[PDB]
Amino acid sequence: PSLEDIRAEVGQALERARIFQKDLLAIYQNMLRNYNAMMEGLTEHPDGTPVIGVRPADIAAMADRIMKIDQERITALLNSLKVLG
Amino acid sequence: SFRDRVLKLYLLGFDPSEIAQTLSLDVKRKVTEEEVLHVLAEARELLSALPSLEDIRAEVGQALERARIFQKDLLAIYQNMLRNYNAMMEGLTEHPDGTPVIGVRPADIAAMADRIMKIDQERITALLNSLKVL
Amino acid sequence: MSVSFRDRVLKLYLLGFDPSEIAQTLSLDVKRKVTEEEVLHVLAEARELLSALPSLEDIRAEVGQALERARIFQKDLLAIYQNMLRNYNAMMEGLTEHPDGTPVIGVRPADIAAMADRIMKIDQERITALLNSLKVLG
Amino acid sequence: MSVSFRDRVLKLYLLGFDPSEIAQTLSLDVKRKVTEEEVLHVLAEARELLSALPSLEDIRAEVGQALERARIFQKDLLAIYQNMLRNYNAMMEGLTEHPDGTPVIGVRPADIAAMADRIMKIDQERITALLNSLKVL
Amino acid sequence: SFRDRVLKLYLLGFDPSEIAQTLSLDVKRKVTEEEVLHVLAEARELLSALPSLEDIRAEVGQALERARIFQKDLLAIYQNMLRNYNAMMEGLTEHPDGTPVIGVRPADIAAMADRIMKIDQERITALLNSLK
Amino acid sequence: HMSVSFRDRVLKLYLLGFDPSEIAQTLSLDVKRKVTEEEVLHVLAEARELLSALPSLEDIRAEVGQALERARIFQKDLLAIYQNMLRNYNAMMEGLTEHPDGTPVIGVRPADIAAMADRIMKIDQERITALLNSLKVLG
Amino acid sequence: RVLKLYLLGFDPSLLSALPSLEDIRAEVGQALERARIFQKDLLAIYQNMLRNYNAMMEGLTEHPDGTPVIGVRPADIAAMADRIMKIDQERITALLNSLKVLG
Amino acid sequence: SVSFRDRVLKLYLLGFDPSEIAQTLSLDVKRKVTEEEVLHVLAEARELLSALPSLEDIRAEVGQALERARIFQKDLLAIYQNMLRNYNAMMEGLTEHPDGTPVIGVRPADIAAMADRIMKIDQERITALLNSLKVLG
Amino acid sequence: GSHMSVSFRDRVLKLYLLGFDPSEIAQTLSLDVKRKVTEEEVLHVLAEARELLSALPSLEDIRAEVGQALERARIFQKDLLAIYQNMLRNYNAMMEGLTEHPDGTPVIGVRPADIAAMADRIMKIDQERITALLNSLKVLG
What we know:
viral release from host cell (chain D), mainly alpha, viral genome packaging (chain D), DNA binding (chain D), Terminase, small subunit (chain D), elongated, DNA-binding (chain D)
């Protein structure tokens, strides 16, 4: 394996992590949707589906998982730059 | 768009043969395994490039803005946790607007406060690090 | 178009909406039909602005706002800590109800210590953040 | 445009209300109509003030206050610790009720040790903070 | 004493206006915000002084005597736990003195031993620093 | 490979915590003769000496390669499972107890999905990268 | 009676002075001895844990002496072993450190 | 003689005191084993245990540890495959495999945890092999 | 071979280290030695014991400690290995439907994660051995 093989693996990993991040971002909006519905007393959404219970801590934990993906991306990009100097 | 879709399926576990047949049925034309391998190899070259520090800063900036959006959500949730706590204290099972008072523990409020404060901390750390690379 | 328009393209990109979804959602707020290509170009302009080196003066402003936000929470937690002690002492003297008619809620010594710790950490974090602002000069 | 007014603008901004919500929430309180632009200006001036370089002397004052606050908590925890022992000792010799009629509440040994450790950690953290304010010179 | 009570209420979470109102009613005169802020400012000035290392040895010292007292409590509890474990091992639900057998896990006993040992370790370390 | 399999079987059972006498009595079946406690102790002493040998660089390269092969496999297994978790999450979100193929909808929490995503990202970014960097360094 | 009550958090209504190296050496010695005493207690408990695990393996709810078989998990036994081995390790570290700094 | 001494050492290291050891071995083979015989055996054991390892001894330990971990890895790999098998059956409705054995449900997190444990054995193996060159011989 | 003077010393020290007051130690041991032992004697005994325990180890003592610790760990490791095998046996029995082993004993459920955890405890004992052996060759030779 060359240095270009390992940089490609990292680049591909970071691109895959962006896919996961996007899935989690969609889940986070579902979590808010359910929370805000539970707040204003609905037991059922407009679409007929049930208002699922969501704890504030779960929402903050999801936000953190999403923010950590950015951080890990930033750290990986910095570390590949560090091999020069 | 075709180059992006090939990459995406490769990254979700599809091998180049499977990508060739799957994408042959999305568009009209028959694409080959070798054409998929060529498209992936070109994306590998792009993805293997050394990043620029300017691009890294743009990622920090975007990440920090994303964190601010979440932080604003959590700040609203925090107010609603206090509303429910201050109601739960007064013995109410029900708010003035009729919605139920949800149970909230002291630890949960402290934990949410900590989550919001950590977002400020991470923002300051990331900003200082962008300067520290000088 | 506007300052608010570019802000909303960024927000929706950062919430995970793909370009075409951002386009349609913004077409409703203005006269024209916003396209994918107009969205990608506003996003790329936003990335350009976000690549700027920070100002340490601006960083100190973020520290100040963060520490002030922490003082607000700290004041909330301090009141909650007193409520926790009120519950604990009512529990100690055998009461199911407070003098104001409200229910006594069960509180463990570990919960009270944890809350005290959370409050003390906020001071610690303030001191650390203030010191880090001076440390970066040297 | 008072200090009580300006502090309230900053507080609501830090609690997650946007400038227009802040404008309206201040408008309906006083016989007055406050704008967004005015709220934005107050916040901008608060950022300028908050961008000041800190003072190590002020930081020592924060360390002093933090240690005093920690003493207050340590005193509360010491009292709780004595209650825990009282209940453990009563629970040890069979009782469900103290001399004065108050109930014997269940205390585990691990809880007593954990509380002792919390109290001792406040002593230790006192010293570490005192050493750091000198060591930063 | 008035400066201490102002500081104390501030540190318990009262804002300067709440301190002013509540203390006005206690001392029977208009105590104003300006006065409370001024009294807090003075209390900060005293607290902003550099610590002496002769004082830091007094704090390093009194920590260790308090820790000794806790250690002695924990040691007595540790004996109670073993007494309970050895009874519960050999079938009993009641001790020689009529007091009940209370359940104890092996892990609980080990954790308590570890707490007691940690106090000795912390004492040694802090005695070495009390010379340093 | 009759003496080598006997040697390996003795070591394996020693490494799984069997008494030398239990090893002797067990392996007497495999080799159709009365193996003694003294023999297995001698076999273990000889195995100890062999295991004190240093690995060659080629030994290590092969070990790294076998480990890289395992990591790729695990990464693909978890990707399929992750997608099945999303399928279940989405079905659940729209009120279905049953999938289009007649199989039941199993409950899945947002945290479970995030955790699985992290498992996969750690394989990509830590496990595989470290093994690749070891291959490079070894030549 | 006087100082003990102050340090336990009651209000009224030298200990700042340095110890000798001799005293610190004595403190180290006593700590290590106390640890040996605890170690011996845990070793006996470890044996009773295995006896219970072994009876639990053979379906017994009662040992030969009539006493009840108490449920023990493999993780609990491993953890207890770990506690006992840690006391040894902490002894070795403290002994080395005493030669470094208290000779 | 050799089995006898090993058993004295074992019981000592298990927290049995010399008097108790002497008594328990006096019954194991019927003769009055003294405390002073036990203490002589244990003093001789301490001497042997005091001996430093050679570098060769350490390499052998590294080698045996690698092999032990490999044996565990293969057990874990077999358990992983089985957990997969049961995930994919529980997925498509089933409560019984083709061979009659029951389907036992498995959580995704548990499958991922097992993968991670197997890969952890791998990084420990590679680290130990590399440290065999960089640290030993 | 009598050793009752040292037994008295050890027991005074032991009870002190378990948190008994000198006066209680005196009252308690008066039974053992059939003699009226005073607080003051117990205090002198503790003071003498403090002096003795303040003696430094030799390097030879530390070598011996290391060696005993590693042997003790070998013993626990062997217990854990036997427990590991039972766990596997039970897991495999459960996998193929059995409620009872060939020896008549009941199949008791086990989680894969707990088998993994036990293997790791056993593997850690090896690495801790290697670490301690290396350290002894470094600093005690």
